[model samples]
Target: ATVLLEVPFSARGDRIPDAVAELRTREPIRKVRTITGAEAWLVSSYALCTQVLEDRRFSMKETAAAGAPRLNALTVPPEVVNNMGNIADAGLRKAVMKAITPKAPGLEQFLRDTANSLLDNLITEGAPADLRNDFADPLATALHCKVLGIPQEDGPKLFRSLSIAFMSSADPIPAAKINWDRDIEYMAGILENPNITTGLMGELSRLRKDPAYSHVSDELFATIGVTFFGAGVISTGSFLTTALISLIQRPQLRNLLHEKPELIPAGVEELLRINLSFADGLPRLATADIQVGDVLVRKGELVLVLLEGANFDPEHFPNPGSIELDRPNPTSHLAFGRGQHFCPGSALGRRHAQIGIEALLKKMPGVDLAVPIDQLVWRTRFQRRIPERLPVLW
Candidate 1:
């Protein structure tokens, strides 16, 4: 059969491909045959997307195996891949979850204070500021430092490495390797002098000494460190800027937020539901035969759970295109994924958005797009569809 559709199918302005909707109506499960001859099952609907993500039969562990399909090779050894997940060591996963996704009441306030501080500096630097660079980017990096237990001064350097690693390269495998090596070495240094009472590094470092985590190796910590950098930077940075741009486009919402700052949390949920960060569904390998809709995804076959498509599925989200704060389940979107691989940082990311956006609205009450709305330039790298810069004037 022919390829159902080339994904990421042309996102222009706020519009993504409607091809997914047509297919979701006609065929939710279809082939995604790449030009390179490798193929995968493209799952479009919300039900199927959730099924594959939560299904242990569908695996991310095999994606790094030597004969796997590669859009852009991550080049991680299969052992490292398994070690990072709960499948190899439950303790490793438990330690990581605790560190990255803390459930403490103090965490939210810390995020809010950090956001306010970042905006304080940005406001002092004056307006006509590029919010992406001046505000969102640094806030994400600094918070990553605090949460990951890396040096704050190293945030820019680490962020730059992550940017290069995620951006498409002609020789992506080796290019990704070089950058990841840089990231690993950087984290190794930080872990050497880890702040034991804070961040994931601190928490994981303590876990390393625990008898329950005896099997957890430094290699696993190193790999988890790399993951922290990648997962921590792009999603938070992109989401914050995207939310700000949305507000700039809708003055009514901005003013509404200013009046009812408490609504910022709900607003953040709405933004996450519709966020375009995961337009290209994350890739996975089927560990066994699993039926999705009418199609059977066999063992070793590739699967792309079209998260963005699922988020827009009308069957699940009526009036899916608009941001609805009162929507029955405002946080239903798969932007941070679900089940086994659900992002540990989803809560922190939301807090950052709530605090960051609220601080911006409160501090720069009159801020508006500095350039023509259509002039905003979006970065076309991987699944991160974010503006190159968010120029705003107050």
Candidate 2:
């Protein structure tokens, strides 16, 4: 039997957890067609979700192997795919992670300052604002772009390429191929000149001449930069928008955080559990034969591990339905996948949410929505998990 399914590169304003909750019981693991129109297995149970995540039987390092399942052929090229994740090179991932981490060290302060700066600018430059366009999206874009060592001049053009590459409606894998090709051609030109300093891109260029990178390829370095841009710009944009919408929805929660702002850290964790910007699981094509619990995932099968279902599991998380401000194991959630593929940018994403939320509460305690919650429009197929519009009346 077919279960109606609609997942894209991004889901705009859908209450994803609620939708997944309904399906976990009704259609835990169902066959579905992807936006790319390829058949895929979408897992919606906690146990199954965990299985898909931790099972190296599914092997994410396929482009490196002699043989592995391919749902779609290389959209870019062999070398670009190698850089994307297939190579699974430890040193390469580590270098990029190092550059991302340092940018957010005084983490919350940067977010706070950024948030305040954006808000003040928005107000002084007042209008009928689409918060996503004017405030939330721009803030994430600028913050991430600045951190990535892309020139301020080139940021907008790259951002357009990034948006196309990250689309949920289209198979981003293909767009990424073009984006990656452009990324290498675009950035390598800059490494020749040293002035392009801000964050990861500059660091990437530095790594090339670096003694440590003698072992790595120019493709790997370029691949890391493109991947970083996609992850940092799109996911963080979605997360910030979701958190902003949630706080406004539950004003009591916002006020509580304002009064006892120390709870902001825990609050960020809860958001991760409930409001991740993407799918509950990463898509995996099996590399070898394996079984997870009773469910059998074989060679050539597609597997999804539902982080959404797991965090909301009544058995794993009691009082699962409620969004508790100070849940005991708030940090235990797996919005970021577990094991080797776990998100390296977790700290940075958490930092943005913590600082962004705090800034919102402090400045706009009376920030109530311009439209009613029921009347609020949502983004079902935008590039990510986000609200339709977040116009609040103070």
Candidate 3:
């Protein structure tokens, strides 16, 4: 279990890049035993990552089956049998896409407004602040819950639902059940009339009544709320902080983006290439028998596809470790998984990140890390990966 320690991942980019490179080149697909004693087959190659994501052979639904393989606590022990139940289903996925698809157009403005508001607070508050809670974390999380129809008042309580869901193996399924049931009840209650509401819960309700999409149901829905946004609050928030740190360290690259601000979009892409939100990758169990790279993973085996593994793959990304701010086409990066499991909220996550970065750059142009690089702390326990607190001065 010591492998779960935050030390190795937080060591430094130099160490991380080298390890990822070795895995991508020498052992693209390998096996790593999880803390739960489940066997997961790790896929690091870009080819395998894309293949498996699109491959019907493996089922996200199966993973949620009563006796299916589980990587984290959220997927097991019977109570919250399929913590990610809705996302795992194909039909429910279509319903979600139909309902939330309307939220796409408003996302850009939503991010811009939210980002600027937070930056204003940062400027007023001054430095040595908690960048995690102050800006990155709150912005991402607020947008998530807001977009999903979960009320802000409900945030303090349900905010950590994803975090605890992973503990599905914990004693008494009652705890997980309450969280799940309450969420559904809340969403359904708001759906009493979806059109008048603003968030996703309303959208699902809206879709239920919309003559065009009446085929959809208000059952279980996934959004930036549960997985994407929940994960986004940590990852994108860390990236925002990390991007600041990286810019402070590399003044030249920072200066380039400052001048040609339109290029900031590309810079964000490059940031994803170099800066991953989590140290690990998505876990995929071999359905029947799968051969990844050179490894033959048997059915029921697990795979941990380190996001960093594919990000630094030389074949997929030339100059594996360098931050090429203007890489023309980087659609291959698993910063957002591709195919079926490609994050449903990638666009929103990117929008939130860009908005926050733009706000900081435009509003607090001179903001820099207040302390030495060695002074910063990293926070991680299981799937949530983030910087503990980025105290900075403008």
Candidate 4:
């Protein structure tokens, strides 16, 4: 007579529910029912979460297999599940990686200029600006456009696809398919465009026609464009938006960083560690029988790795809630994940947040939530936890 607990305790990114810590303490690996009505083992705690991620047998691609217990319905096509694998298989991984690197020539400066420009626009528009739409999201979109070697004007049309493209649901989303098809076509066109010869998409376009990669499918190339752009934009934007909330809430920390910008990188890392951007647990399917904590996860069973559980575990991080820049194990958090499936965009993501935060603090040292904290509306059934409209004042 035990009813299973439903995941995603809450959608509000500004706060972590007390239940998360309680569950981590009591049952680090416990069964839970997802929105899809599929039962999945929710793995909490740093050790167990790390174990699941570090093992290749826990396959991310297999999570999309037929009849596999799902964390949620597939947002992209089933084949798209193995996006990074496809990129590597096509011999384009190196090019893709280099393009997204924050250290790429002019990339960091682009981020800085973009961040400052967005802030200037907001400042000109006066107080109570919606930072999510006006600043964070636009900045992310523009950065992705520049990185993808696509026309900057095309960013909004592609961004419009994401609200439906990134949904978490029990049933297949029809509009998601519509957007996917449209976005794929758009990416495919970019591959053939003569003027597109600069960023990741440009490199992909060249590789698509090269004899060495002639065997690669056009689907794979287009999928890379759509997936990378969508994932990168959503992640960087959501992280920066929530990070702003964390900074504004702490006046002393915000002022210190504003006064001494050199500490921004360390502060950004801690922000990444504490960020509640991921709305659902990172999903994987067991390809073999594996012992994870107290449970024997059988083949084909679904496992959801809770990133915050590992990042916030007090056992590993003494005083987990507090952000201490001097912490010895600063960059070890699962914010970008661990092992084989770790996020490739991590360096760029960190730079995005660091530059965004640094610019914001310098531009608006008086910035704070325009409305009461509770008034901000958080998005639900979506990939990242973010306020729909981040109204702020300086």
Highest TM-score model number: 4
True-vs-predicted CA distance for residue 291, candidate 2, Å: 2.0
lDDT of 2 by residue, 1-394 (tens): 9654745323444355466677777777776656545566777677777767776676565522434433334445554434536335636665577777736455446556778988777667754345676667676777776677676566566666755564444333666667767876776676656786657888778777889668877656666666677678778777888777767777778888889999998877887787756632466777777766545666777665666677787767777756797676777777777765788888888877777777767766777767766665655534455565777766
lDDT of 1 at 129: 90
Candidate 1 local lDDT, 139-177, one digit each (tens): 888877777776688788778866666653223456567
**How far off is residue 297 in model 2, in Å?**
1.7
In model 3, the worst 10-residue window by lDDT is 5-14
Candidate 1: Cα lDDT at 304: 85
Q: Tens digits of per-residue lDDT for model 3 on 194-285?
A: 34365556555555567765643445432323443445455556567666666666667667777778877787777776675565567665
- Model 4 agreement with the true structure over 305-384: per-residue lDDT tens digits: 99999999999989989989999999999999999989999998998898889889989999999999999999999988
Question: Which portions of model 3 show Cα errors greater than 4 Å?
Answer: 1-17, 66-69, 75-95, 98-107, 149-156, 160-163, 166-178, 193-196, 209-218, 221-241
Per-prediction TM-score, please? 0.90, 0.85, 0.82, 0.99
Candidate 1: residue pairs that collide: none
Q: Model 4 — which ten-residue stretch has the worst lDDT?
A: 102-111
Clashing pairs in 2: 8-168, 9-168, 10-168, 10-383, 12-379, 12-380, 13-379, 280-307
Question: In model 2, where do residues sit more than 4 Å from their true spots?
Answer: 1-14, 17-19, 63-90, 102-109, 169-180, 374-383
- Stretches off by above 4 angstroms in model 4 are none
Model 4, TM vs. native:
0.99
Alpha carbon lDDT of residue 66, candidate 4? 91
Against the unseen true structure, what C-alpha lDDT does each candidate score?
Answer: 0.75, 0.66, 0.61, 0.92
Better of 1 and 2 by lDDT: 1
